[PDB]
RNA sequence: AGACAACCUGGCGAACUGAAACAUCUUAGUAGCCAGAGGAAAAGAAAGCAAAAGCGAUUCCCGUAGUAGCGGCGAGCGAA
RNA sequence: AUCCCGUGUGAAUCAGCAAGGACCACCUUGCAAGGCUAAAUACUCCUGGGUGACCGAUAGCGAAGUAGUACCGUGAGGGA
RNA sequence: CUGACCGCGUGCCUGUUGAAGAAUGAGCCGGCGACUCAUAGGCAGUGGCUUGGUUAAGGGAACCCACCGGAGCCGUAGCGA
RNA sequence: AACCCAGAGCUAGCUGGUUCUCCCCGAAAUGCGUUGAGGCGCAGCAGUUGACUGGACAUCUAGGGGUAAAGCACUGUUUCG
RNA sequence: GGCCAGUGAGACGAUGGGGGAUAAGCUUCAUCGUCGAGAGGGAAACAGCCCGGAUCACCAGCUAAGGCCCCUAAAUGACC
RNA sequence: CGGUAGGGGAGCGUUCCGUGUUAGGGAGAAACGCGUGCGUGAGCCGCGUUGGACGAAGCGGAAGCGAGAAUGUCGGCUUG
RNA sequence: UCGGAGAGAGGCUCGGUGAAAUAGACAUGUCUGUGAAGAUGCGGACUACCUGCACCUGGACAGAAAGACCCUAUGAAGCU
RNA sequence: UUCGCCCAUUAAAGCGGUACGUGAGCUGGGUUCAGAACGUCGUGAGACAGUUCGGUCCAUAUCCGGUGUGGGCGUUAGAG
């Protein structure tokens, strides 16, 4: 506990008289100051610089759509062979503590670090490097189904007409 | 928690006032004046503890001058001092002034030594 | 319900932060009068520059929720 | 009629001098017309800015008989002075920093 | 029928101020006035949320979040 | 978009109608144009208990005595 | 305590390039009288945990407080409109 | 452009004031922009805290230059022959 | 680099100059010194000239600038 | 080891709370007045032919916490 | 011109009652010099016993607060 | 009005400083304050180093300074 400055008591003490505001003018006056981003009336830095690319128009900002995990973390943790990784078992060992936004998210696996064990992994996506190193080590990659996109019947007829075409052609 | 200033003021003031005893007039009464007067007192005091060291040397030198000038027609403070030094004596000016008043015969002797050797 | 500081929105559409924590901005002057600016210039005015240390104060003071390393 | 118009000094003039060191690309001279002419290992710019192509010492010469040209030559820096005043004092500073740091945690009581 | 501190509901409804001027904006649907009722009032039993998985009248607190957004894209305002 | 009002026009009944942030298709959800309802929440002219790193007569209520008194003001009001 | 006479000695504050100023302010004395609080952001100093840290409202033998309360929040991936 | 009360502790880049002691260090009155000029933003120059460093004070050498002096080779100017 | 201030009216003096009348204790720039924010001594008194940068005590000593008839410290010194 | 603006370090005191319904106190507390006492100072420690009932030190905590300036402000009393 | 005398109400003395603006402290000379460039207060000289009373108004940049004039303020209001 | 012109004299009808010397001694203008009118400028509110008529400066002398007039004390015993 360091004792506080009490301004305006004596000069011998500390900031006495003026209190360390020097002589007069606007900074030494009582009350709300001037806005923090404001330079004198010269056009402020933040104004004379152009708005950031996407933001500037109202294109929606970029947001993380997966909880990224590398293989580093999976190595460090206490996984014995046969163990199921998934999402749940990474909350269990606490390597991922997801918040609201992250609660609602899926999982993704990114290659970094070299795994040694056979583990059974369940996630909604992998990077290429990831599943390369994983299938190299002898780990079984269970990819989980995303939630179905609702498509009306007509566009099903179209996307199926496609598949019929490819199929009649190859066969 | 409300805090009246209470006695903390009047002690300070009183202790100041004690200083200013025997100042003529309102320098011994009004606190506000007394303050200033205290500072100035302390200040002159400090100044004249320094003046002092100058002043007594002034004095002593003067007395020495008079004490010597009695002897020779041509003799001075300056001449004397110069001779004290080329004779290697250490007596400083307080001592020669005090021996000048309090033991005048002594200073005559000293002068006779200085002359004999300068002869 | 206290009062929490408000992000100055007109500064947060301008500046942002890189992964290592330094502030960056766009460069000024590509919107019009391009024909008469040489292509070399036009390229220079298209990149992202780290904000000049001097301004960091004002910037920082208006974007209290921006995570920023000043390299201490 | 009425005066009082003028211009910021353009910052022209010799940036690196004779027998100093120059990086590649480093500007030696910003001039209006060509008061200096490009010598060897040295490029000239559109505004007649003279700049270096090579690391090395820059040297001014008589283009002849009147004018002047600047050129850059590669130097050799082998002579690192092993035992000399420069080295001695700099070493001293190093050693004193190390010593005075080691006798801190190296303090009893 | 009149009386009734604050709270509440409805009706009328500013200005200084902030924006380093000011007119859009802010102050603020604040103060003030008028009317009304209660120990609370108002709201309230999905023509509601949500998103392809689900909830199950209203009010209040924490949080989401100073986020998405709004804005002489300025000062500022600001959800679900 | 959703919501609610001036002026003018002006539908459909469940094979419907509305909502899902212009609008159209599809699917999901819901049933406007009749009412009424407790609690959790706000407040102190107050009543009864309790506590106080609250005041102690220039403080604490304006008011520890004729205190909204004396006095001032035509009056609203000021006010020891 | 008094004070013969000698020496030195241009009230205080404010504010100014600069004042003893004939620059402002105070009749004198005693009281009252000013960088405060709430909430957030940054930084520093101290602790606590680092088997990552922490709980909010809420509940509590009235308060405090034991013990709960992981919803949240901060740190673990960036680049890109 | 009445008065009283209320918004209202309006607002005042302005003037006044801002209270205990000792120790260490210690400026500036410049540049740029400003509806700016007695205000403010950044820079310059304090303090405190860290990280790198090896200088500073002297001594000699080397660079480029177009001032003082000097000159009439150019540009003007000028007297007489 | 971090955290976090004041300052952004300067004054004269030396030197280089511009404006002005090679007027101004005028004005405006450039390289320096002092004052500002500096007490002590010399300058009769006397911010900015000269000496000197005040931790403190001493009724000690040596000097700087400047001085040695009396006021008032030191020579009513010496030789031209 | 001069110092204004200004920054940093180290302290003193006031009222209150914890220890504490403390030690001490009508064999005289706070306060008031005094000191050949001790501190770099803020102050401390001691003393009373005053005063008449409270209240230290230590180790900690909190502020309505220190005044000579506001043509401050309220009382008291001068000058003329 | 060029003033004179007189009467009343004061002024003046004595008894009774008894204010006010003002006021840092005042032990409050002149000349000259200095100095923020007009000094009782700094220097050098000069002059001055202490203290009343009546008169006089040269000084104290005398006294009665924002300077009506000039400028400033991104002040206020009235008016076109 | 500074300036200046004239009349009649006169020895002559000097020029300057003293904050217009002198407004806490007096009085006119001037700071053309608010009313009004003329010329002129302005669409206009209004304006004028244009003119015109009207238009509030107070004062009990504290100190110094002054003109007078006393007391005290000194003048080495006291007096006229
Ligand atoms: Mg504090
Ligand atoms: Mg401090
Ligand atoms: Mg002060
Ligand atoms: Mg400060
Ligand atoms: Mg001030
Ligand atoms: Mg300032
Ligand atoms: Mg303000
Ligand atoms: Mg405000
Ligand atoms: Mg703001
Ligand atoms: Mg755009
Ligand atoms: Mg992004
Ligand atoms: Mg997270
Ligand atoms: Mg109390
Ligand atoms: Mg107080
Ligand atoms: Mg004495
Ligand atoms: Mg990151
Ligand atoms: Mg474009
Ligand atoms: Mg800053
Ligand atoms: Mg040029
Ligand atoms: Mg080319
Ligand atoms: Mg009724
Ligand atoms: Mg009624
Ligand atoms: Mg009722
Ligand atoms: Mg408005
Ligand atoms: Mg307005
Ligand atoms: Mg405004
Ligand atoms: Mg404004
Ligand atoms: Mg209820
Ligand atoms: Mg109801
Ligand atoms: Mg139901
Ligand atoms: Mg129903
Ligand atoms: Mg709807
Ligand atoms: Mg919706
Ligand atoms: Mg409506
Ligand atoms: Mg209709
Ligand atoms: Mg129908
Ligand atoms: Mg609709
Ligand atoms: Mg629905
Ligand atoms: Mg229906
Ligand atoms: Mg409807
Ligand atoms: Mg219904
Ligand atoms: Mg109802
Ligand atoms: Mg009383
Ligand atoms: Mg009272
Ligand atoms: Mg009392
Ligand atoms: Mg004396
Ligand atoms: Mg004297
Ligand atoms: Mg001035
Ligand atoms: Mg004065
Ligand atoms: Mg001044
Ligand atoms: Mg002044
Ligand atoms: Mg006062
Ligand atoms: Mg006064
Ligand atoms: Mg007064
Ligand atoms: Mg206080
Ligand atoms: Mg503040
Ligand atoms: Mg706070
Ligand atoms: Mg904080
Ligand atoms: Mg820690
Ligand atoms: Mg709790
Ligand atoms: Mg509870
Ligand atoms: Mg509770
Ligand atoms: Mg009015
Ligand atoms: Mg206010
Ligand atoms: Mg308001
Ligand atoms: Mg205003
Ligand atoms: Mg120093
Ligand atoms: Mg300077
Ligand atoms: Mg201003
Ligand atoms: Mg600055
Ligand atoms: Mg520094
Ligand atoms: Mg050369
Ligand atoms: Mg040369
Ligand atoms: Mg040449
Ligand atoms: Mg020349
Ligand atoms: Mg020549
Ligand atoms: Mg020629
Ligand atoms: Mg020629
Ligand atoms: Mg400037
Ligand atoms: Mg200036
Ligand atoms: Mg200033
Ligand atoms: Mg000068
Ligand atoms: Mg000069
Ligand atoms: Mg020249
Ligand atoms: Mg000449
Ligand atoms: Mg000149
Ligand atoms: Mg000047
Ligand atoms: Mg010199
Ligand atoms: Mg200053
Ligand atoms: Mg200095
Ligand atoms: Mg000096
Ligand atoms: Mg001197
Ligand atoms: Mg010097
Ligand atoms: Mg020294
Ligand atoms: Mg020193
Ligand atoms: Mg000597
Ligand atoms: Mg002598
Ligand atoms: Mg001689
Ligand atoms: Mg110091
Ligand atoms: Mg200071
Ligand atoms: Mg104590
Ligand atoms: Mg006590
Ligand atoms: Mg106490
Ligand atoms: Mg007991
Ligand atoms: Mg006692
Ligand atoms: Mg007590
Ligand atoms: Mg004590
Ligand atoms: Mg103690
Ligand atoms: Mg008793
Ligand atoms: Mg205790
Ligand atoms: Mg207070
Ligand atoms: Mg007072
Ligand atoms: Mg009074
Ligand atoms: Mg009296
Ligand atoms: Mg008569
Ligand atoms: Mg008569
Ligand atoms: Mg009468
Ligand atoms: Mg009488
Ligand atoms: Mg009076
Ligand atoms: Mg006298
Ligand atoms: Mg002078
Ligand atoms: Mg004079
Ligand atoms: Mg004198
Ligand atoms: Mg004197
Ligand atoms: Mg003197
Ligand atoms: Mg007079
Ligand atoms: Mg008179
Ligand atoms: Mg005076
Ligand atoms: Mg302005
Ligand atoms: Mg305005
Ligand atoms: Mg004659
Ligand atoms: Mg006259
Ligand atoms: Mg005359
Ligand atoms: Mg007069
Ligand atoms: Mg007239
Ligand atoms: Mg006309
Ligand atoms: Mg008349
Ligand atoms: Mg008198
Ligand atoms: Mg007299
Ligand atoms: Mg007499
Ligand atoms: Mg007599
Ligand atoms: Mg006698
Ligand atoms: Mg006698």
Describe the protein.
The PDB classes it as ribosome. The entry lists the keywords translation, cryo-EM. The structure is cut from a larger assembly and holds chains A (171 residues), B (119 residues), C (72 residues) and D (109 residues). By secondary structure, chain A is an alpha/beta fold. Chain A has helices at 71-76, 88-92, 100-104, 128-137, 153-170; strands at 67-70, 107-110, 120-123, 125-126, 140-143. Chain A has a domain at 62-146. Chain A has 5 helices and 5 strands, in the order E-H-H-H-E-E-E-H-E-H. Chain A is elongated and about 95 Å long. The N and C termini of chain B lie far apart (90 Å). Chain B has one domain (1-119). Helices cover 19% and strands 27% of the residues of chain D. In chain D, a hairpin with a 5-residue loop joins strand 5 and strand 6 (50-52). Classes of the chains: A alpha/beta (171), B mainly alpha (119), C alpha+beta (72), D alpha+beta (109). Chains in contact: A-C. Chains A and C meet through loops of A and helix 3 of C. The complex binds magnesium ion (MG) (143 copies). One magnesium ion is lined by residues 51, 56 of chain A. Chain A binds 8 RNA strands through strand 1 and helix 5.
């Amino acid at each position: 506990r360091k004792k506080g400055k009490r301004k305006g008591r004596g000069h011998a003490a500390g900031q006495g008289g003026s209190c360390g505001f020097g002589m007069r003018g606007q900074k030494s006056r009582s009350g709300p100051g001037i806005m923090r981003g404001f330079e004198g009336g010269q056009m402020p830095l933040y104004r004379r610089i152009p708005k950031l690319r996407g933001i500037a128009g109202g294109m929606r900002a970029g947001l993380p759509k997966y909880v990224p995990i590398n293989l580093r973390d999976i190595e460090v943790a206490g996984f014995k062979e046969g163990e199921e990784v998934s999402l749940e078992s990474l909350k269990a060992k606490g390597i991922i503590n997801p918040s609201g936004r992250e609660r609602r998210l899926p999982l993704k696996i990114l290659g970094e670090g070299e795994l040694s064990t056979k583990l059974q992994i369940k996630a909604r996506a992998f990077s290429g490097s990831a599943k390369e190193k994983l299938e190299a080590a002898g780990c079984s990659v269970t990819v989980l189904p995303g939630r179905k996109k609702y498509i009306k019947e007509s566009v099903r007829k179209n996307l199926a007409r496609a598949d019929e075409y490819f199929a009649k052609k190859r066969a | 928690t409300r805090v009246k200033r209470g006695y903390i003021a009047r002690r300070r003031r009183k202790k100041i006032r004690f200083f200013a005893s025997s100042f003529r007039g309102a320098h011994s009464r009004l606190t506000r004046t007394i303050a200033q007067q205290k500072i100035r007192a302390l200040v002159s005091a400090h100044r004249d503890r320094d003046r002092q060291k100058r002043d007594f040397r002034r004095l002593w030198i003067t007395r020495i001058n008079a004490a010597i000038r009695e002897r020779g027609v041509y003799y001075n403070y300056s001449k004397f001092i110069h001779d004290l030094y080329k004779r290697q004596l250490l007596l400083n000016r307080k001592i020669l002034a005090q021996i000048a008043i309090l033991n005048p015969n002594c200073i005559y002797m000293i002068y006779n030594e200085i002359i004999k050797k300068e002869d | 319900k206290g009062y929490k500081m408000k992000t100055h929105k007109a500064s947060a559409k301008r500046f942002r932060v890189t992964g290592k924590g330094k502030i960056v901005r766009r460069r000024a002057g590509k919107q019009h009068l391009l024909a008469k600016k040489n292509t070399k210039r036009k390229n220079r005015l298209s990149k992202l520059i780290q904000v000049d240390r001097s301004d960091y104060d004002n910037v920082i003071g208006a974007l209290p929720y921006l995570k920023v390393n000043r390299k201490v | 009629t009425k005066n009082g118009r003028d211009s910021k000094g353009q910052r022209l003039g010799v940036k690196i001098y004779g027998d100093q060191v120059a990086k590649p690309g480093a500007i030696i001279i910003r001039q209006r017309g060509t008061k200096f002419h490009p010598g060897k290992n040295v490029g000239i710019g559109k505004d007649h800015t003279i700049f270096a192509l090579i690391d090395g010492l820059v040297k001014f010469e008589k283009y002849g008989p009147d004018k002047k040209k600047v050129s850059v030559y590669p130097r050799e820096i082998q002579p690192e002075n092993p035992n000399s005043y420069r080295a001695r004092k700099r070493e001293n500073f190093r050693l004193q920093r190390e010593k005075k740091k080691a006798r801190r945690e190296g303090y009893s009581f």
